[PDB]
Structure 1
C-alpha cells in the first residue's frame, strides 16, 4: 500500500503535501470546454500502431488495475498528432466511478463519463521511462472515455481476469492481449500539455484525449467495481471513484484535431 489514495483523509485534496507539484501550472486532468478548444489545422494525423503489441501481466496496484507491455523495442507505438518522434506503449489502466455518472478524469463541457482508459507511452529519445518521467515532453497518454451501453468485446478478456487480481499486489499472466480492441472508430482528439494524474503528478505528459467514447456494458463496469484498494486480509474497501477531479487550466490552450 502507498499513503496516498482517493479517500477523505488521503485523497486528491491531500496530495499536494507530499507532492507540491499538485498545485502546479500544468496539472491533469482538466475540463475540455469544446467551445474554447480551437481546431489546429497544423496537427499531423495521429498514428496508433499497436499490431505488434506484446502484453505481459495484469496487476492490481492498489489504485487501479494495469496491463503491462514489453517496451524493450518499437512494438506498440504512438506517433504523429502533436508528438515529435516515437512514443512506446508501457501500460494501460482505468479510472472509474461508483455510479455510471462519474468515473472519468477528463470531462467534456463538465460531463463526466463512467470511466476513462489511459494508454501510457514514453518518448524513446530519453531511452527509458524513468528518464522520460523527468522531461516536459517525456510521456504521451492516450485517453479514451467509456460510456455504459453495448458491451466492448475487446474488453471482455480483461473483465474475465479481474477476479484473479481482486486485492492490491495480485498479478496474473496477461499475454497476447490486443489493445487495438479498446479503440473507437475515430481518432479525432483534443490535446494539451499536462501531468500524470497520480503521484508523482509529474508535468511531462502530452495528453491526447479521443472525442469518441467506447461503449462498455453495465456488466463489464460492474466487474471493475468489485476490485479492492486494500491488500488481501485488510478491511474490504471497494476500488471505486479512483479518479482525480479536473484541475485549473491556467495558462493552457486545448487544441482540437477536428472542426
Structure 2
C-alpha cells in the first residue's frame, strides 16, 4: 500500500490548509454500551443507531458516526503511541473510529471502503490524573483476558480529547488487519495528560485467553510507515 498508517508527522511535510471548515465533534454519551479486551487492545463500543453521534466538518464530506474507540500503548512510559510527531513517540495513543454513514451501509463495509472511516488520534502523555479516562481504567481488572467484556454506563468520548483541538489530517489506513486504506486520519496535536497509574493499568491486560499461559498486553502498536507522496495538512498555522 502507498497510504499506510501510522506515520511520523513531520514539520517538513506539513502544509497549512486554512480552508478546513471547523471540525464538529458531538457524541451521545448515552449510546455507550460496553468495554472489551479485543485480544490486541481494549475497546469501548457504542450503539451507532442514531446519526446524531459522531463528527463532521474539517476534511470530511459529511457526518461520520461514532462506532468505537480504543488504545495503543507500550511496555513502559517511554514509547507506545502509533504516530510520532517529529520523531517523538508518546506513551499511548487513543483512536476514536467513526464511519461514513452517507457513503456506506455500515461500519463493517465502510472499514474496507474508500473514504469509509474517519479516525481521530489522541496522544496520551504523563501528567495530571484524567478523570474521564479513570472511569474506563476502573473496570480494566474485569477484562484482563482476551474477549472478555463488561457493561458501560454513559460515556462521552469528547472528555478524552484535549481542549486545544488543532490537528493534522492525511489519507491513511487501519493499523490492524486488513490494513485497508479507508481512513481519513485526524490526529490531534495536543497530547492529553494521564497519571502514571492509568498507563500502568493498561499494562495489566493480557493478549491471552482464560486458562492460557499469560501473555502480557503491551506494545500493541504498528511501526511507522512512510508518508510517500501523500498530502499532510495542518488545521493550524505552522
TM-score with structure 2 setting the length: 0.97
The 2-side partners of 1:156 and 1:198 are apart by 26
Deviation at 1:236, TM superposition (A): 1.1
Contact map agreement 1:52 1:75 (CA 8 A) in 2: no
**In the alignment, which residue of structure 1 is the partner of 2:33?**
56
**In the alignment, which residue of structure 2 is the partner of 1:256?**
234
User: Higher strand share goes to which structure?
Assistant: 2
Contact map agreement 1:54 1:75 (CA 8 A) in 2: no
Structure 1: gaps spanning 5 or more residues: 1-23
Contact map agreement 1:53 1:179 (CA 8 A) in 2: no
**In the alignment, which residue of structure 2 is the partner of 1:170?**
148
Deviations 1:131-170 (A, max 9, x none): 2123210000000000011111110010000000001010
Q: Give every structure 1 segment of 4 or more consecutive aligned residues whose post-TM-superposition deviation is greater than 3 Å.
A: none
Deviation at 1:93, TM superposition (A): 0.3
The 2-side partners of 1:86 and 1:230 are apart by 37
The 2-side partners of 1:245 and 1:215 are apart by 23
User: Among residues 95, 99, 104, which one is paired with 2:72 in the alignment?
Assistant: 95
1:134 has 2:112 as partner: yes
TM-score with structure 1 setting the length: 0.89
Contact map agreement 2:7 2:227 (CA 8 A) in 1: yes
User: Among residues 220, 223, 233, which one is paired with 1:245 in the alignment?
Assistant: 223
1:149 has 2:149 as partner: no
Deviation at 1:52, TM superposition (A): 4.9
The 2-side partners of 1:249 and 1:89 are apart by 26
**In the alignment, which residue of structure 2 is the partner of 1:82?**
59
Assess, with a 3 A threshold, how the Cα gap between structure 1 residues 52 and 62 changes in structure 2: closer, same or farther: closer
Deviation at 1:51, TM superposition (A): 4.3
Secondary structure (helix, strand or coil) at the match of 2:59 reads coil
Structure 2: gaps spanning 5 or more residues: none
Which of 211-220 and 69-78 deviates more? 69-78
